């Protein structure tokens with residue numbers, strides 16, 4: 001029931017970083033994301049875009065269990081996103097759909113402008129690994145901490161690769 | 166547990182010269198006083214991540230380069246750091262086989278390919294083509310012997326026939342393997358398996374034939390030919406048989422394209438003996454004395470080490486391995502290799518047995534190896550959606566504007582493909 005947190009800062013207005021994050025994947029800064037399928041999009045009473053997206057992934061930590069497990073491959077990610085342009089806030093929760101029962105990994109991202117005003121964006125991140133059969137080990141967890149921290153860091157670079165286009 | 170410090174533990178396949186490798190280890194311990202243990206666990210290529218991910222496993226893992234990318238992806242392998250003058254002693258295309266993401270993840274040991282191996286007393290003139298082997302078998306079976314026997318359990322052996330008329334693993338271009346494009350269910354892959362399957366279906370081979378059965382028979386003069394690799398020579402040498410190693414045959418006029426392997430030594434990310442394993446591999450293994458010690462046990466193939474390869478490339482057996490190796494491709498090191506090998510393993514065995522027809526088997530293998538986004542069929546409708554939405558999302562939404570979605574029509578059409586897409590899966 002562990003964590004990995006972060007708070008990155010992007011050097012562009014909130015608008016463009018959100019325009020980016022909404023057309024993020026697939027893209028060359030993260031080739032482990034095979035593609036993103038938007039299953040449902042709704043605007044709510046408050047004017048916030050709700051999307052349900054299902055991602056197709058590769059070498060993320062539910063594949064690290066295929067090591068200890070024995071044999072498998074493709075891992076699917078449920079994602080719910082809400083963007084409120086009035087409140088200037090983008091939220092995003094994700095879970096693994098397949099290769100669960102073993103481990104479940106819950107990420108959560110929030111893009112928002114810097115509280116001091118510099119036309120720059122700050123993203124606040126966390127990942128919640130829970131597992132039944134809680135073996136792990138600090139080594140395996142460090143592996144998981146490391147691979148989480150890379151999709152994280154590749155996700156940002158994926159933004160910059162988009163907003164510089 | 167955590168690996169043992171002050172000790173080197175080594176995994177290498179049991180069909181390789183491990184008693185020789187053990188003798189390099191002894192030379193190391195005799196010299197450095199650091200004990201070395203050489204084991205050969207079964208299903209080695211699967212068990213290493215199973216324990217090197219928990220911090221366990223061997224200090225040094227010995228396998229073909231094709232598995233080592235999957236390992237580096239999951240950070241199971243330390244990055245190896247030889248100096249410039251040490252990598253000048255190894256052929257640089259072998260290093261190429263162990264560069265993942267521009268990082269070196271293993272020491273290359275030796276280039277391996279499959280060659281044809283035949284009994285000369287039984288058969289003085291080996292078939293130049295697969296399509297003539299049924300006859301060879303019908304004429305030899307009349308003398309109680311048989312034509313061919315090579316190990317159907319591992320797809321490594323039956324692949325150069327599948328690759329012959331145009332099967333491949335993934336498509337290579339632009340410095341990248343396209344993991345989304347897999348040439349295992351094309352015409353020139355169905356045709357090769359259908360031949361093998363027909364060999365079986367016609368009692369010319371046998372679907373149960375594994376490494377041991379095929380090795381036993383060829384060596385005991387029971388079958389005229391085998392397919393196998395350099396490691397296998399030292400048992401025919403110690404057999405009556407007067408063998409020849411030669412170029413593989415051809416299928417539909419095309420040569421057999423073996424998946425070339427580069428036996429590689431990987432250091433474990435979890436090893437507290439990393440500097441001890443560098444010393445072992447660089448200064449005791451990749452020496453002519455080191456490599457000869459191994460190569461005299463079971464032969465290594467064309468070693469990666471230039472100085473020793475000079476004496477080696479004189480062997481007519483090495484020449485024939487290299488003939489076949491140059492008629493095939495180097496295996497890629499990408500993490501999808503295992504899904505590839507598993508799919509082919511399943512397809513061939515299931516076709517060979519009858520549980521699946523050929524087209525069934527390689528259809529299944531198309532999808533199990535492809536790694537496709539669920540809605541790959543509909544990318545063209547998402548592309549024209551996405552353009553509409555990103556335009557709406559930017560201009561009539563992010564800057565406040567009201568009017569409901571102008572992209573509802575394209576969405577629902579794409580929503581239809583992606584909903585049949587999910588249903589045809591899970």
Ligand SMILES: OC[C@H]1O[C@H](O[C@H]2[C@H](O)[C@@H](O)[C@H](O)O[C@@H]2CO)[C@H](O)[C@@H](O)[C@@H]1O
Pocket residue numbers: 178180210229230231232277318319320321322426506
């Ligand atoms: O059959 C699938 C395996 O193919 C190769 O394994 C070869 C290996 O390279 C060779 O040295 C060894 O002795 O024989 C096996 C076939 O049994 C790949 O390197 C493996 O990744 C595959 O599992």
